[PDB]
Amino acid sequence: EHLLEYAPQQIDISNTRATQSQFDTWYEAVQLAYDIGETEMPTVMNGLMVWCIENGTSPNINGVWVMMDGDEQVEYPLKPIVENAKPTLRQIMAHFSDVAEAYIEMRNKKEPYMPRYGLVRNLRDGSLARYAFD
Amino acid sequence: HTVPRIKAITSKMRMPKSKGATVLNLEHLLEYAPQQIDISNTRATQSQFDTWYEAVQLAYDIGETEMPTVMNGLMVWCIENGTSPNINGVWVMMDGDEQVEYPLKPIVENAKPTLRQIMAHFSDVAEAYIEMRNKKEPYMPRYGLVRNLRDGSLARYAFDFYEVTSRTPVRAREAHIQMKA
Amino acid sequence: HTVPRIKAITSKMRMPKSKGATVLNL
């Protein structure tokens, strides 16, 4: 009587997506590392995935990621993000996979815009670009 | 009577949430559109290019308003001989017929993460320069001559530090693809 | 609006002191 009523979403119980308990830990841990309060970090995470779209999700820990204000680049250390992401950054970043395609398609209607995941692998198509991030 | 139209479906789309609050503000995403090559990783960071610019400036003991002349010939050399030379080497730049030599150790050593990514900042000017010097005599950089690039028009996309942006021609992208020939 | 830049940190650097007075003149 419970199985004929228990229908969970496939992606919620999946293993490719990191657990909701393991995403909150990564969210708060990165929040503590950057010394950025709430109601302001969403701006930082607003540009984290845009960077991760272009440059994949397996970068060097000692590196740095960039986000633009107008024309000036701002830099955030990459060590807290990769180090505090369990089991890995890709699975933690998969929570944004629903928004990434909506963002890529939004920026593909005015000029061609292909993430580097496709350019390196020679993805010779225009419409199939919103499914081309790591 | 009225034909029975199919009830349109609506794909709910899952926001990434954290303790009942979303982690993304959408009024900023619907307005945040950075240039692809600026946030890219193939091009070295603007903060990592200024360091390489000043460091090489200090190493050559050449003041400002004069170094642009030196950098005017650095990329021309780098077009012909790639961007991964020996550190202990030397690069050449001509005044008329006389060659002048600059040590290659400061340039390669102080280039982070690598010389190619630091030199990619000139990739927009290199094709404009190659095309300018290709309209009077055939002029193919050695990156193409070694790999047998059998074309004349597709020569301005044939240097080592060319960055594949979204707007390069498809023929250029494949022309980069074969790599070693 | 303006991107939230990371508050630069400043590594204090410990002078060798002796009875409240430094032993090095910089």
Residue numbers in the entry:
A (entry chain Ah): 68 to 201
B (entry chain Aa): 42 to 222
C (entry chain Ar): 42 to 67
Paper text:
Potyviral CP plays a role in virtually every step of the viral infection cycle, from transmission of the virion by aphids, virus assembly and disassembly, regulation of genome amplification, protein translation, to cell-to-cell and long-distance movement. Here, we show that we can control the shape, size, RNA encapsidation ability, symmetry, stability and surface functionalization of nanoparticles through structure-based design of CP from potato virus Y (PVY).
In the absence of RNA in VLPr and VLPh, the C-IDR in CPr and CPh is disordered, with no traceable cryo-EM density beyond A222. In all three structures, there was no cryo-EM density for the first 41 residues of N-IDR, exposed on the outer surface of the filaments. In wild type VLPr filaments, the N-IDR is responsible for the axial connection of the octameric rings, with no obvious interactions between the core regions of the CPs. In RNA-free VLPs composed of wild type CP, each CP subunit is linked to four adjacent subunits, with N-IDRs acting as clutches.
